[PDB]
Structure formats: C-alpha cells, structure tokens
Amino acid sequence: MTHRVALITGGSRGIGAAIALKLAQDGFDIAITYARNEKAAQKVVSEVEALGRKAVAVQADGGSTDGNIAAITKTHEAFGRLDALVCNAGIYPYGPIAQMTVTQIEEVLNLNLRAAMVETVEALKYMKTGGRLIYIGSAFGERAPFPGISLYAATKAGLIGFTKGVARDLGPQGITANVVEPGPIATDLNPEDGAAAAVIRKFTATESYGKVNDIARTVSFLASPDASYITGASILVDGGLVA
Amino acid sequence: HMTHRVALITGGSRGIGAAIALKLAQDGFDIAITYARNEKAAQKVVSEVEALGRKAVAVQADGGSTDGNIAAITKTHEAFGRLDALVCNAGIYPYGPIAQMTVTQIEEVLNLNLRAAMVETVEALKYMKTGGRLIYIGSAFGERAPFPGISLYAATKAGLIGFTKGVARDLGPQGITANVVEPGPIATDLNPEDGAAAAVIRKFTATESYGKVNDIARTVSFLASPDASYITGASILVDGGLVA
Amino acid sequence: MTHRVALITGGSRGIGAAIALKLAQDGFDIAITYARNEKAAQKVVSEVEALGRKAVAVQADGGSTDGNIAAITKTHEAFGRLDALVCNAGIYPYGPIAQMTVTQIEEVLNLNLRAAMVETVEALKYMKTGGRLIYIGSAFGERAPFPGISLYAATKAGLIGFTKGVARDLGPQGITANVVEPGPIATDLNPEDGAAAAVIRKFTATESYGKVNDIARTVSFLASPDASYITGASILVDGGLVA
Amino acid sequence: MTHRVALITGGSRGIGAAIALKLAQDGFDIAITYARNEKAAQKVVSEVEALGRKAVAVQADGGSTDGNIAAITKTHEAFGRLDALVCNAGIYPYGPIAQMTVTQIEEVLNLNLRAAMVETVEALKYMKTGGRLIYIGSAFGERAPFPGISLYAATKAGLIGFTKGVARDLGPQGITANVVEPGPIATDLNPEDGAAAAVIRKFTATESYGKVNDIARTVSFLASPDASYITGASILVDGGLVA
C-alpha cells in the first residue's frame, strides 16, 4: 500500500489506456476494467509494469451493477486502498430519437450514467481525504450541434449534474469530483479521416480531432494532490467545439 | 373526436402536474394524466378538467417501468386519436449524501426521472406531428446543487437538459419543439413552505421564498402555445433566483 | 399614474417596436427611446395611442451616459412612475478579432453593456416592488458558433452575468431581472435573404430565422405580475441555435 | 528571442505574481504590468531573474487604452516576440446595484473587459501559431450567490463570452483562448480576513479560500504546448463554489 491506487474503467484501449499509462507515470498503481478483450488489458498491464508500478486487470461488465461493485471490490482486494476513480467506460449510440429502442436507451443509461453512480458509491467505502473522482463526460454534454445524439448528450449532461452534487457533498471530506469533456478524439475505433469525421471536425474551432494524450494530461492535472481546490469543475478538451 | 389538441401529463394527479393539467385545459387542450396509485386524486383532476369544458382521462401507469411508459402514450392515443403535447412531469426526489445511496435508489431515480422521459418521447413521436410540443419538468437543481444531499436528483435533472438539447436538434426541421422548465422549491401539499428545512432552502433563493404551482403551470402554457414555435432547446428557470 | 409604465430603449423599430406594442396591449403606458429617426418613433407613439394608452418618444443616445440617465429621467417626468425597463438598444459589430479597432470596442461596450448598467441604476431610483428589468441579450451570448462575433458575444454574455447579480440584489425588494436571448430575427435591417443568412440559419435547429413577435411575446410573459417567481432567468428564443 | 515570452497584466502581486514565477519556471521570459508600486514589480523581476530568465516591468494604466496598447508594445520592444498573454489585472467593486455610480461602472468595464479586448487585439499583431491567450475571470462570472457583485459578475461573465468568440476566431491559426475562473483566493491584496470573507467561504464546498498556486498551476497547464486542443474552455478553481 505504499503508492496511491487508480481505478480506470474501460482502461484497456483508447482514452482509458492512455489515462492508465499517464497516471502510472505520475506514480499511481493501476487497476483497469475490461468487458471482453483480455489481451488488450494484459498489454496495458505490461506497459504499466514496465514503468515500475503494479497493475491489475479486472473483468467486469460496466453495464451491470454487480460489475460496477466488483470493479471497486477487486481493486481494493488487490491493493488495500483506493485513491482515484476514473469513470471512463461508455458507449456512443447514434440515430434519430424516434428510432431509438428501449434496449438502446437502457444500455446507454446503464453504462454512461448508472455505472458512474454505483461505482462512486462503492469507491466511497474506501476512499479517504486526498481522493479523486474524475468522470469522462463529453463536449456533447454541453452542445449537441447535429442530429442523432440525444441519448448520448443526455447521459453526458447527467454526469455534469452528478459531478456538481458529489463535489458539494464531499467538499469538506477532501475528496474532489470533476468532469473532463472530450471533443472528438482520434483512436483506432474513432478515426479522424473520412466524411463523417469531416462533419464533426467542422464544428470544432481548430477543425481537427484531438488525441488521447489531450485527455490523459487533463486527468493527470486533476488527479494531482495539488488540484485540491478544483472541485465541481468541467474541463472542455474539444478543440473549441462548444465555443 | 379529435377537434382539440391533446396533452399528456405524467404524474398529473397532484401538485405541479395537476396544475399544469388544469392550465392546459383552460388553454384548450383535452387532457390525459398518468397516475401510479391514487385513483381518487386522479379522478378529482379529471372532474376539474371536465368542469372547464374539456375531455379528460386518467391512465394508470407505473412511470418506472418501460411498459408503463409505452402504455401511457398508447392509451392516450386510443382515447383521443391524436397527441399534441407531452409533459414529462412525474419524478422522484431522493435525498441524502452520495455515500449513503443504495443501488435501488440509483436505479429508481434513473428509471423514473430520465428513462421514462426518453421512452415516452420515443413513443409520442409515433403520433406527434408538426406543431407538437415536448416539455420536460427538470429542476433548478439540474444547474446548481447548492447544498449536500442531491447528487442523484441533480444528475437526472441535468440529464434532461442534455436530452432536451439533443431532441430539439433532431426535431427542429419537423416543427416539434423540445424545452425544459426548471422549478426551484415549489410549495405543494407534500412540499410545504413553512418549517426550518424550508427556511434553509429558501435562503438560497434570491426572493427568499418558495414558489407556487401556478408559477410552473404558466410557463408550461407559454411553451405549449403554437406561438412558441421559435423556442426550442431552451431551459426556463422558475426558481426565485436560486441559480443566480 | 393609473397604469404601469414601461420604458423600452431602441423602441422605434424592429424588436423594440414590437415589444412596445405588445406591452401597450398588456396595459402598460409606454416610453421609447430613439437615437435617430423621429418619424419611426412617432409612428410607434401613434400606434400605442390608438390602443388607448399614453406614449412618449424620448431622443437619447444610448451610447452616452447622459443619454442613459435622461431616458429614465424624462420617462419619470412624463409619467410619474416606472414599472418596467426593457434594455433593447444595441449593436452588432462583426469581424475578426485582430481587426477590431479601439473605437469599435468602446462603442459595443458602451451601448451593449454600459447602457444597461447605467439605465438600471437610474431606474432603481423610481422602481418599486412588482418592478421588472428585462434585458435583450442574444443566443450568441451562450454560443459563438462561427468566427467574427467575439465582441458581441462578450457583451451579450456580460448581460447574463449582470442579470444574475441584479436578480440576486433585488430579490428581497420584489423586482425581477431576466434576459431574453434572441437568435436570428428577421427585421427590415436584418432581412433573412442572402448567403450570410443561409449560413446562420444552418446553425439553428429549425433552419429558420424568427420574427419580432417571438421576442415580444417573451417579454410580455416576463413582464406580467404573475412572473414574480422568475428572476435570474435566461430565455433562449433562437430556433435551437444554442442546442 | 530563444525563449517564449509571457506578458502578465497586474503581475506585481497576488495571483499575477504567482503566475509570473510559475511561467518563469516553465521556461518563459516574463513581462509584467503594474499601475503603481514599482518596488513590488522590481521584486518580481528579481525573483524571475534569480531563476535565470529575463524579466521586465512595464508601468501602465490598465484602465487606459493607451496603457493597454503600450503594455504589448513595450513587451515586444524588449523581447522581439510574444507567446502568451495573461490578462490578470482587474478590480472587484462591491455594493448594491442602486448605489453604483457612473464612474464605478466605467472603471470596472474599462479594467475588467475593455483592457482584455484591446490587449488581445494588440497581442495578435505579434503572436503566432502555438500562442496562448489566458484570461483570469472568476467563479462569480458563473454564479452570483450573494448581493453586491452585479458589476463584477457582468464583467467576468463577459470574459467567458469573449473567450468563446476569440477561440472560435483563432482556432485555425493555432492560438488558443481559455478562461481560468478563481473562487476566493487568499492573496497579499485580498486577505482571508473579515465578515465579508466569512460569508464567501460558506458558499464554497470545501469551506475554504484557495491559494495563489491553485491558479498559477492552472495557467501553467493551459500555457503548455501540449494544451493545444484546449480552447474556448473555462476552468473553475473555486473549491466548489459554483457547484
């Protein structure tokens, strides 16, 4: 228990993986959650270990409350402490509101909002003064500039409200709660080239997609002990999309 | 049959919902209201709408189940043959520090305060046409959480802001508007304006007062008007200055 | 002094004129300010008088503090009371920030923010419980979706902040302060035709410009004695532009 | 011209001074503006020089457009380049809106909003891709929780709008514009003492004043070359006041 411990949900690839590595460099031991691809998770585990930190991968369905609880539980069993929770796992449904099914609605709520709520409750059994709760929201929580993202925008705006309320509750306990709001970020699964990306890019002021490091450095900034006076905050990292 | 616009108000058997139902009826809407259990309160609202010259019906439905959300729309369309406004008013207010919340409270608030609006909206769009109105009852606490104990409620109510923005964007060219009304503390039977707890909440308002159900009903009426066609994606705080 | 009195700045044409007529129908006696164009002001005065209300036109440069003070002073001399102030006068500079001159900066601050502030202070020498302060902001105070409007967006966001602070101050005195935020509204001066308008329109969800009645109705809704619980609020009337 | 150059207005004391030292440590040569108090300014200069950087203090009235222009001009004359502008100078009027004079209104507008606008225009004559514009706003630009701060809230909300519009204009040029929003910060100029301070603390979720380093760290985070995808953003550093 000599190092701070960070749990990153969906930490096996993309933004999550980059956060895990950045926090490991900052001196956190690392737990990540993954739904299915054990090999991608073990790769992240190895890269964290190559930096001299301990890492563990926990299999968990972020869409289930049992999986939300088990992620915290297994992290605490592995390390004996919990210092930062980064709720990064999420999905992006896309389509006109009139075509959305009950299943899509339940899925996006369960993964993008309920998970964060349930994981936060469970984390607070273990977290102490100096703790950090960081939610990965979206710029689309503040602006929905094109059709097809009503469900996503709802869940991501929900995280802003949750963050404000939690920050208010935990202020005197010395735990902070903040939301990072990515714009379009290039990853394997979300490429920056092509006509669909061009449409999204046009709503950014920089006319570009960002990169995973743009988010990881902002999580690192918030997770620092020196960020003790930042709570309730939202940080847009979006190339000016919401401007 | 079908000569008047029809409004469905969820949770319309008492408090804000009931007042919205009466105000819309006076504006010329036939009324459907949902209720979970108190049939007598629902029938009282039905009678008061009828006394104003409109048709009214009360539909029993659990807003916390998706089947109830679908049925509310289905039964309203069966009774009246059209749907012109949906007012998603039903909701619950859990209270307590976040570390004391249970899984069940979390599911219940999400199910009623957010999922219901989403599923009801999808179903309403099977029937709604140009000139339609989607009006969600959010809260001032969706924008400001000035004291501890309201994390879950704030989350769901902020969620409705984001949903409203996205839906407004989707439906703009179809001539259906989507807007959110954000009440501060409103006095009702269940939420009285007197007592030490209310004195604390009241101090966060600029007017140092609770509002009344008419404050919210009027605002719904303003948004539901056909003349409100250029208002969409909007939030209207009716909160005595709480969020200032 | 039998009727409530509303002062509307810039009330001789466009949005201002439509507000003046709508409030006259609601039962307010009317004062309007005009910078130039006495004949347009006198037409508004006649239309208000045709409805049975008293009306006066006051010449005043909204960009000078002496004009800001005189507008209130002359209104109170003509009617003996003041019940609503609608700060509608303003300008819309357009262009890249690096090309803006000191003169354009001063002019927009003077007319779009300083005027509202000075007029509000003067109005509060006469206003009592039941009073109404209504500022005409802009949707661009909340979203600046294209280049060229940095100055305008600054002043119109400034009104939002002013509104919040004033609402807070005046709460216990029974005066409300609220901002109406128009999107693009078709008027004589802002036609609706042309490639520029086509670009703006595409940012709205309705893909249309609004009309003056959309704003007048909203002012009327706020100015009512039944709007006593609405204070600090912003109302977007923008066809979904800010969505 | 081997190092990046940062100009910090009001950089002789409090938040400004802390920002100047932090950016010096990040590797910026430093220009600071001061109105009066040359000895405080010369102290900051000496501390920057002790770190191995070049520093200069420029006397300038931030409330005069000539002073706004001269700050940039003298900075460019000393160093031959400009890489970051931090608009930190400002004032905090306090009192009920009805008691505010025309002189107070002009003053707050001139120092808190016009200065930033004019300095930004002049800076863009020299700044290039990789440039940083960072405005020091306030949490009170988003929330005015008590009476007496209308004017200040207006100017600070104005900066948010200005930041959004500027970010939108400069996005494709590779210059970012962002606003930091301090809550109550204990400073040499704004001590954590008295009944007014006691009232302000109670609105924060942490029930505390912050410290200058809380702001300086955040400016440093935004001024980095790795912050390129952050633009149009506001970062609350306010102990949860706006929650």
What layout of secondary structure does this protein have?
4 copies of one chain form a homotetramer.
Chain A: E1 5-8, H1 14-26, E2 29-34, H2 38-50, E3 55-59, H3 65-79, E4 84-87, H4 102-123, E5 132-136, H5 150-170, E6 176-182, E7 185-186, H6 195-203, E8 210-211, H7 212-223, E9 234-237
Parallel strand pairs in A: 1-2, 1-4, 2-3, 4-5, 5-6, 6-9, 7-8
Helix pairs in contact in A: 1-7, 3-4, 4-5
Assign an overall shape of chain A: globular
- Count structural domains of chain A: 1
CATH class of chain A reads: Alpha Beta
CATH superfamily of chain A: NAD(P)-binding Rossmann-like Domain
Q: What are the secondary-structure elements of chain A, in order, as H or E?
A: EHEHEHEHEHEEHEHE
**Within the CATH hierarchy, at the fold level, what is the topology of chain A?**
Rossmann fold
Task: Name the CATH architecture of chain A.
Answer: 3-Layer(aba) Sandwich
Oligomer category:
homotetramer
Distance between the termini of chain A: 43 Å
Largest two-chain interface? A-B, 47 and 46 residues
Structure description:
The structure is a homotetramer. The first copy, chain A, is α/β, with parallel strands linked by helices. Chain A has a single domain, classed as NAD(P)-binding Rossmann-like Domain (Rossmann fold, 3-Layer(aba) Sandwich). Helix content of chain A is 43%, strand content 16%. Chain A has seven helices and nine strands. In chain A, the strands form two sheets. In chain A, strands 3-2-1-4-5-6-9 form a seven-stranded parallel β-sheet, sandwiched between helices. In chain A, β7, α6 (195-203) and β8 form a beta-alpha-beta unit. In chain A, α3 packs parallel to α4 (102-123) and α4 packs parallel to α5 (150-170). The longest helix of chain A has 22 residues, at 102-123. Chain A is globular and about 50 Å long. The relative contact order of chain A is 0.14. At the A-B interface, α4 and α5 of A face α4 and α5 of B. Chain B: Keywords: Oxidoreductase. Chain B: Residues 5-184 form the Ketoreductase domain. Chain B: Its EC number is 1.1.1.-. Chain B: Belongs to the short-chain dehydrogenases/reductases (SDR) family. Chain B: InterPro entries: KR_dom, NAD(P)-bd_dom_sf, Sc_DH/Rdtase_CS, SDR, SDR_fam.
